[PDB]
Amino acid sequence: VYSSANNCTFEYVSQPFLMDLEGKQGNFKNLREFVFKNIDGYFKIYSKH
């Protein structure tokens, strides 16, 4: 995902999330929507499965 890093400030972990790493060719069963916003430098996340 990157070559290297030098210095930074923020790091967050939250609760663990478990997904499936097996990929198939069948029809979809779930829909996920995400909204990313930036007002006054504040990052906003909106999602609901």
Add this chain to the structure above:
Amino acid sequence: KRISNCVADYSVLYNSASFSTFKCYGVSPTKLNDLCFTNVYADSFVIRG
């Protein structure tokens, strides 16, 4: 070491007495719980008395 994104707790820092020097330049340590800062840094080294 950079310390950020946490609730500061200096209560155990001044209530103890194992330390020998508790001088705070610039700001006064009598009001520290009412002050909110953006970045907190902490260095560490050993030197003779």
